[PDB]
């Protein structure tokens, strides 16, 4: 990895565009204007890409040769990069202050600030915008996953007496549906801020390396079938496949995809009749989890529950909701996103089925179908010092007041009512709102403050 | 990187689930029935993750330790992985056949197939499904980028009579808007299959390392401002900022973001009056490229062109469309996706503005706002050998006929009319169609066939002339 080649091309030309004699460029990140966001992922970026010796003579030469061909011109700041290499042993003279990871903050607040610590490196602040703005992704995955946790908690509380098993109710199925191996690890780790169930193995190693947990692993899974393991037996042998799989995993929970040919026949005739003796004999710690994977998600879930309810002994909870026996559960892992999850739990509640009967698997909906526009994650310059005079800088486009940015030196505070406020124009210097909530997390090539994954999870907890 | 830890967790348990006495598991990838897709990205995956010694005693031990805690159980095929390590020096006994990269294939056709070459490794075919299915991303980016090139080509030909500059008309602005550094490189490389303009520097190194070009670089850019380089001068000094920047880059094209405070004032009064003398003196090879970045994308483009048309000399080309002077152009780099791109070029055509006046910059629309669902990229088992007997396997869910998968051994052929057909149930073995278009690209840990990036670009070319 070469940080000199890890920016938007036009940033290579910016050192020539700032006002002459600029000694300081100060910038910030916010989720402009999903009312609250989970701040997560900056520590990964700081450790993997920004800390230590990130500049070498070879990296400078490599960048110089690439940019000369890419621009068909010599515009690369070889002198500027050589200065960092010689003066600081290739360590970045930058200071980053950030809100603690896992913190849940309302939209429109400063989340982190960046500034150069050497006047010669005024151009460095925004060079690293590209790599830091990629924080949008773990922030957005963690926020969207926590918003789904709120729906699940609300319905699980209403339909049962409690929140038992909430941490396992939304399982990450997103490994194949993301854009890369690196994205799979980042996104799966962001989902693990809120839940404990994942099939995206890449998330485990990232948490272990960059954050750390008291427990050996941050996420868990159970044995499960896929269409190839059912269909490989042949169309007329679906029962044989099911019998083999549940006998192989007789003492652990086992998820079995049941829609290869006819989900309704599989539930009523195969599970409900032919193999019923192998299911009713299972332990409460080893249920069969039936997996539909096609059709209208709500209609399919309700019909599967009706079928199972007529074949297996159903009880009524203390809240008056129907409950399958403890050796039998369902997982809906097709077409699940925050909208369909809400439609399904509401549809189940209206048909008097407890949410303890169901779990959800989400792939693309959880990890891929997200963009930087969802939370309006943005990085902007708010303060510069030119000719030794500090000026409050901002954009304010005529046609879009939503794109207006903050002015001057920023700080995050607690209001008298305990809410959050971002003070602009260095107003935090007046001791009216107490102490700034942002902490220095990076300074001059070193990570100065870090958080464990257990601390992040505690910070990200729901009030409920 | 550890391939034993690079699969969906449940795949760790599948070796115990397949029918006993299974010696072959054969699977395929298709973009299930954007009528045609660009096949691109498999070569990256083969080289980075699948080739050579991918199994070591240390990787087996690390996997075993993680899975014991992840499952709270000892389900992990240690014998199976040790076998590959001992018999094959950790090289995968898999054969992958694929259509050549850059090939444009209608939907619902086999694009690649995977099978184990050793009977003991029947479980390995689908172990690597997760890693191979990630090819959905470069295929989708390249396809969606090509569909935008079709729109631009149609409108550029209609309003100007030629395709000059088409390859620089859609610039990649997506580096910050993607989910990771790895995604940035893959996605940027996929867009470069169709165009030559990028700011996502990451794509250059990926192409150089995994594909290669005769030219020193596959993508190009020009100097451009950002809001920080304009706003840093202060609100009352936007004209000074503009003046400094166009003077610094007087001999090359320069893009200047002009909406920091009031895009319309910047166009009419700053560029159009105060600094007009610095614009009209510029070379045809060094235009000023005005960049709006807010407001309704179509209304803004149209209003910017109407302002510039009243401040600068406008000509009428041979097609009857208005053309700004050659030293002045516009780039719309906000809210651009395939739908808004079509809306802007149609809107411009209705107002009699040539498409030679505009370029587009696309970020999230080009590289992030895409999912595996767009082309229904899917990997499924179609053939198995159990007790020495080959059986055609498939799924066919009652509630969704669109999720039905293909049966048996597959092959891809040219039809007599020059279209494509996927033959199922090993029917390709009859010599009724020409040669199978799928070629072996990987076998037993070796990449057996590679394509250069120049070959991929040629294969992905549009028909237009
Ligand atoms: C009370 C209990 C039964 C409960 O609610 N639990 C919550 C749910 C939990 C669970 C259920 C299923 C799966 N895996 C699958 O169904 N797979 C993994 C996949 C990955 C990718 N594509 C498809 C997949 C199918 C894992 C954990 C068991 C405990
Ligand atoms: C006829 C000529 C003028 C033409 O059509 N060309 C096609 C367009 C080409 C070009 C125009 C602009 C930019 N870059 C920018 O505007 N930047 C890069 C960014 C990256 C991320 N975010 C915001 C950005 C703003 C690069 C190349 C010049 C030649």
UniProtKB/Swiss-Prot annotation, chain A:
Report residues binding diphosphate. Answer: 176, 227, 291
Name the enzyme group at the top EC level. transferase
Instruction: Work out whether the entry's keyword set contains Secreted.
Output: yes
Gene Ontology, cellular component aspect? cell junction; cytosol; extracellular exosome; nuclear speck
Instruction: Name the organs or tissues of expression.
Output: Expressed in large amounts in bone marrow, liver tissue, and muscle. Also present in heart, placenta, lung, and kidney tissues.
For beta-nicotinamide D-ribonucleotide, which residues are the binding ones? 199, 291-293, 333-334, 364, 372
Please give the chief subcellular localization of this protein: nucleus
Protein's GO biological process = cell-cell signaling; circadian regulation of gene expression; inflammatory response; NAD biosynthetic process; positive regulation of canonical NF-kappaB signal transduction; positive regulation of cell population proliferation; positive regulation of ERK1 and ERK2 cascade; positive regulation of gene expression
Task: Please give the annotated consequence of changing residue 199 to N/S.
Answer: No effect on activity towards nicotinamide. Alters specificity, so that the enzyme acquires activity towards nicotinic acid
Catalytic function, reaction form: beta-nicotinamide D-ribonucleotide + diphosphate = 5-phospho-alpha-D-ribose 1-diphosphate + nicotinamide + H(+)
Question: What compartments host this protein?
Answer: Nucleus; Cytoplasm; Secreted
SUPFAM superfamilies according to UniProt: Nicotinate/Quinolinate PRTase C-terminal domain-like
Pathway(s) served: Cofactor biosynthesis; NAD(+) biosynthesis; nicotinamide D-ribonucleotide from 5-phospho-alpha-D-ribose 1-diphosphate and nicotinamide: step 1/1
Describe activation and inhibition of this protein: Inhibited by FK866. FK866 competes for the same binding site as nicotinamide, but due to its very low dissociation rate, it is essentially an irreversible inhibitor.
Q: Which residues carry this modification: Phosphoserine?
A: 452
Modified sites of kind Phosphotyrosine: 168
Asked whether the keyword Nucleus is assigned, the reply is yes
EC no. given is 2.4.2.12
> Sorted alphabetically, which InterPro entries does this protein's record hold?
Aldolase_TIM, DUF5598, N/Namide_PRibTrfase, Nicotinamide_PRibTrfase, Nicotinate_pribotase-like_C
Key words, A-Z: Acetylation, Biological rhythms, Cytokine, Cytoplasm, Glycosyltransferase, Nucleus, Phosphoprotein, Pyridine nucleotide biosynthesis, Secreted, Transferase
Explain what the record says happens when changing residue 227 to A.
Reduces activity towards nicotinamide
Q: How does it assemble?
A: Homodimer.
Its family remark reads: Belongs to the NAPRTase family.
Question: What does the UniProt record say this protein does?
Answer: Catalyzes the condensation of nicotinamide with 5-phosphoribosyl-1-pyrophosphate to yield nicotinamide mononucleotide, an intermediate in the biosynthesis of NAD. It is the rate limiting component in the mammalian NAD biosynthesis pathway. The secreted form behaves both as a cytokine with immunomodulating properties and an adipokine with anti-diabetic properties, it has no enzymatic activity, partly because of lack of activation by ATP, which has a low level in extracellular space and plasma. Plays a role in the modulation of circadian clock function.
Q: Which NCBIfam families match?
A: PRK09198.1
The protein's name is Nicotinamide phosphoribosyltransferase
**What is the source species?**
Homo sapiens
Which lineage? Answer: Eukaryota, Metazoa, Chordata, Craniata, Vertebrata
User: Which gene does this sequence derive from?
Assistant: NAMPT
């Amino acid at each position: 990895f070469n940080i000199l080649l890890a920016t938007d091309s036009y940033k290579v030309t910016h050192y020539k565009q700032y006002p002459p004699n600029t000694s300081k460029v100060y910038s910030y990140f916010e989720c402009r204007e999903y009312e609250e966001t989970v701040f997560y992922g900056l520590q990964y970026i700081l450790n993997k890409y920004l800390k230590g010796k990130v500049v070498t003579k070879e990296k400078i030469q490599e960048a110089k040769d690439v940019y000369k061909e890419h621009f068909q011109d010599d515009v690369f700041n070889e002198k500027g990069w050589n200065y960092i290499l010689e003066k600081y042993d290739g360590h970045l003279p930058i200071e980053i202050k950030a809100v603690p990871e896992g913190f849940v903050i309302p939209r429109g607040n400063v989340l982190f600030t960046v500034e150069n610590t050497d006047p010669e490196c005024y151009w460095l602040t925004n060079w690293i915008e590209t790599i830091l703005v990629q924080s949008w992704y773990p922030i957005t995955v963690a926020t969207n996953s926590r918003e789904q946790k709120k729906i699940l908690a609300k319905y699980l509380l209403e339909t049962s007496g409690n929140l038992d098993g909430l941490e396992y109710k939304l399982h990450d199925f997103g490994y194949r549906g993301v854009s890369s191996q690196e994205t799979a690890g980042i996104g799966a780790s962001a989902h693990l801020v809120n839940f404990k169930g994942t099939d995206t193995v890449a998330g485990l190693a990232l948490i272990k390396k960059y954050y750390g947990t008291k427990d050996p692993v941050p996420g868990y899974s159970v044995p499960a079938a896929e269409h190839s393991t059912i269909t490989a037996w042949g169309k007329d042998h679906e029962k044989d496949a099911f019998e083999h799989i549940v006998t192989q995993f007789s003492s652990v929970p086992v998820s079995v995809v049941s829609d290869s040919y006819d989900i309704y026949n599989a539930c009523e005739k195969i599970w409900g009749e032919d193999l019923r003796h192998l299911i009713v004999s299972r332990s409460t710690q080893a249920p069969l989890i039936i997996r539909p994977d096609s059709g209208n998600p709500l209609d399919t879930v309700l019909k599967v529950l009706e079928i199972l309810g007529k074949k297996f002994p159903v009880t009524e909870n203390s809240k008056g909701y129907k409950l399958l026996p403890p050796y039998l559960r369902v997982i809906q892992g097709d077409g699940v996103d925050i909208n369909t999850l809400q439609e399904i739990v509401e549809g189940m509640k209206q048909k008097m089925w407890s949410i303890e009967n169901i779990a959800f698997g989400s792939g693309g909906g959880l990890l891929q179908k997200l963009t930087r526009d969802l939370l309006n994650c943005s990085f902007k310059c708010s303060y510069v010092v030119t000719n030794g005079l500090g000026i409050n800088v901002f954009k304010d486009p005529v046609a879009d007041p939503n794109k207006r940015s903050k002015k001057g030196r920023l700080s995050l505070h607690r209001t008298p009512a305990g809410n959050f406020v971002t003070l602009e124009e260095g107003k935090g210097d007046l001791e009216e709102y107490g102490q700034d909530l942002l902490h220095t997390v990076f300074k001059n090539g070193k990570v100065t403050k870090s958080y464990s994954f257990d601390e992040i999870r505690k910070n990200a907890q729901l009030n409920i």
